[model samples]
Target: GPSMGVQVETISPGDGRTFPKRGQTCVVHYTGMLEDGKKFDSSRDRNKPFKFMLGKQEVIRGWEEGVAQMSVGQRAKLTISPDYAYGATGHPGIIPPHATLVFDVELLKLE
Candidate 1:
């Protein structure tokens, strides 16, 4: 059955690092893919880290939730349900409609 749950798998936990909360920005490296293991986006592949404000709807709901719980140097894999991911109107030419997203993300710095 299709679900709306967001799965978070913490790969590497940081030691004594600060977590990024709402109103703060974070630097991250991520690779986004589909269930078939096809890549959709990658900040690490571009050799650039992504910087985004936390908890402001700037990104997908699953991403906001998954990354918010991470500290600096933390790495996680997020499996996002359709409800927390791109909907029927997904990013054209890259993501397909109603795609369940998977992301390998690393929390680099919180600013």
Candidate 2:
């Protein structure tokens, strides 16, 4: 049975090769949730995908590393531990200290 807390199931882009290199740009759709399955963020809600450059420090460490291992049209579920996430100083209003995160992400394109 799947764990109740922050379970990550990689749907596509199974290997790390799917990840993008540093400084590469890509577009993606993602849903972020807590261990209890509470959604904190979603591109689908906006009816649009999120775009960003890889390894540019625009996002958290886990995100930058996780996305780097994906390819176009790939998808994955990332279970980020606190150390790999916001850590001791978590993002206020969203992430709390020692909180784990789950991200269901789809890689749309790479540029």
Candidate 3:
């Protein structure tokens, strides 16, 4: 883990192109849960991959950091500390303050 505690544990490696760069679109599927195994969100449940532009802060800091390390076809588990996640002020009605988060993420494609 880095000093701020954003961890990326590879489940499967990608054999695609290089990692994404800033401003590029990323497509991923993920399941988000709390430390206690309580689920909060999942792109899989929606049967759709989530898309966001890299380095645009469209997601949380940990997501940006972890996803940047992934290439298409890669799968990983991202363990994120509170600071890198929602921080002291979390998402209303979804996350608690200072809660650590876990995500099973897959980098499906990039454009």
Candidate 4:
């Protein structure tokens, strides 16, 4: 089978700079897409950033890692394999089994 999702490109500070140690709070803007480039979610559409605290476990592991790498005004693309995503017990109508995921993220701010 194909390698699944491919990362087209990433800008400066691609891996991003980690801040807000474990259990710290932060906010960000993000755009999530499927392997085929279909959008799933976008914080820009809401005109607001998503807020969460590190180590709170409110989101998935991939999201935690990806967000940790970001700095204010920095952006990155995360290509995640199924293992880091929804896993086998996929979320119906949103995620499918063994699917690769893509995320175009922007660190709007952190607190």
Candidate 5:
């Protein structure tokens, strides 16, 4: 069987950095895809970094959990289970129902 929950794999360890705290802005670049390797969304592709509040729940549960453990300049691959992703009702016209999302995310900075 496949893995469950949010599986995080570090790609690059940051240099002398700490984790972001709640209410702080997190800057990052990420590419999101499905299990079959089909691309969906990417901040790098748009030549822009995505920013969000650390504990604002602006993104998915898996993203919140996976990114919370990272520091500035850290890069990671997160394979999110459906329970941590969109679950049964995925975003229309982009993600499908009950989809498990994968992401290559790089934490750039904290502000």
Candidate 6:
């Protein structure tokens, strides 16, 4: 576990061109779930990756911190604390306040 108790486990160690930094676009496929394994969202079910720009606060704090540690084509499972996740104010209807989140995330592409 790195800073803030965000646990990342490597499922696939991808090739290295470079680790993604802030301001770069990232494409990720993920299954977002709660601590009890209750699913909330999944890009894989939609058969599409979620797109966002890193370090832009477009996504959650956990995503920003975790994904920045990856290179292209890396797959990891992130067990994120509430502080790094939805926090006290969570995603409406999907998450509860101060809920710890689990996301199986894959770094698909970057541009």
What range of 10 consecutive residues in model 4 has the weakest lDDT sum? 3-12
Colliding pairs, model 2: 18-69, 18-70, 19-68, 19-69, 19-70, 20-68
lDDT of 4 by residue, 1-111 (tens): 664333433464533555556776677777888989999888888898788887888876777877666566767787777777777877888888889888877766667
Off by over 4 Å in 1: 1-4
lDDT of 4: 0.72
lDDT string for model 2 (1-111, tens) is 643233345686544555566777778888988989999999989999888876577876777777665666778787787777767888898999888888877887777
Q: Per-prediction TM-score, please?
A: 0.87, 0.80, 0.90, 0.80, 0.89, 0.88
> How many residue pairs clash (N, CA or C atoms closer than 3 angstroms) in each of the candidate models, in the order given?
0, 6, 0, 0, 0, 0
Give lDDT for model 2: 0.75
- Candidate 1: clashing pairs of residues: none
lDDT of 1 at 37: 91
Positional deviation of 48 in candidate 2, in angstroms? Answer: 1.5
Compared with the true structure, model 3 gives a TM-score of 0.90
Clashing pairs in 4: none
Residue runs of model 3 more than 4 Å from their true location after superposition: none
Runs with alpha carbons beyond 4 Å of true place in candidate 4: 1-18
Ordering by lDDT: 3, 5, 6, 1, 2, 4
Q: Write the per-residue lDDT of candidate 5 for residues 1-111, one digit (tens) a residue.
A: 765588889889986368878898889998998899899899999899999886788988888888887777788899887788877877788887877889988988878
Q: Give lDDT tens digits, candidate 3, residues 29-76.
A: 999999998999999998999889977888888888888777778999
C-alpha displacement of 97 in model 3, angstroms? 1.6
Best-performing candidate as measured by TM-score: 3
Name the Cα RMSD for model 5. 2.2
- Judging by lDDT, tell me the better candidate of 2 and 6: 6
